Amino acid sequence: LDVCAVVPAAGFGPKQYLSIGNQTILEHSVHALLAHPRVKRVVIAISPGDSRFAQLPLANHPQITVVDGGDERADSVLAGLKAAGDAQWVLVHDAARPCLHQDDLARLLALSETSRTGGILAAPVRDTMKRAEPGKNAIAHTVDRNGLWHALTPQFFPRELLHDCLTRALNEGATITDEASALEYCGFHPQLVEGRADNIKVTRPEDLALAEFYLTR
């Protein structure tokens, strides 16, 4: 039942080292993964040369493992998988998603009891979206929002399947984004587990206050 999480955290050799309260965003994100007792270990893949991570209180946690990752997210995740131990299922979570709720994580982890290809947390589109004309900030058309979802993280998959698929994706020079996109590239259709929309990613300076608001709840 053991699960190992992998947090790709390249870039310091990203806003993961920004703080909310007394912890960095990366620490909030990792403690959110450790709330579920099935998660036995969190592997953080940092860039060669990153001396920032070693400065955190989290660097001395007994369930954290730090390895160097590579150029692209897929290389980082593959580096993290080598340290997953005996886990047969792996969660991959964004270092800058510190508002992950335990309820959502538990619902996603329930997929290993039933599915073979895994799935991701996701939030249905509730607003209206527009597609811009190529290379211009003018509207081309309205995008149908029926069945349209935001992919969130974690993304939870069988370890070997994830490994094999990310390797094929890289070896064939496929353009991928999240781990689900690699599975999709390999012909699979991961489950969409609806999660809270406040599990946001901190990518711009204003996202920090919003994340804080959500954390205080």
Place this chain on the structure above:
Amino acid sequence: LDVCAVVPAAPKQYLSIGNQTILEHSVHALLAHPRVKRVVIAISSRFAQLPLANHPQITVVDGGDERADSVLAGLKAAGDAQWVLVHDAARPCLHQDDLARLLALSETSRTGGILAAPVRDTMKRAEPGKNAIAHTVDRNGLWHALTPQFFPRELLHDCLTRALNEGATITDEASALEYCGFHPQLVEGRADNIKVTEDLALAEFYL
């Protein structure tokens, strides 16, 4: 340069934050810019108890069957306004710098445009009737539509009228321009410009 705003409003907008209803917050944000001389509110009662009814810059018109009908009624009350601003009654958080940037379109555009925020998450399309991923939807060039939506008065009136007569499926004002073959500009605005419907608490934080 004069602009007339239209707020199609025929309970979310009657929820309150501080001393005011969401509708009041939304109207006051529009009235904060000097070019927006008047705000026409389409109404179908709750509105009458508010102080908006007796404000010197606020006009009331009857709301219609759908948002589109309401907007056309608001255009009938727009006077000589050459450009019109249409904004949701349930969007209380609008910053003046984003409003100013949208209003600047009148100086360079013949079509108008809308406030919008880029999509940053990877997006997925589900398999029909299943909670499984069919494929990824490219997010480059993908934007969340916001309001206000700002357009030349005649183009908006003519297009909306034609779309409605032809039975087009209209969501926002931009979608009517789209139906007619026009391409409104996307002006990036802040993402705290939320539409109330939990939203209350977040809108208050932003305010």
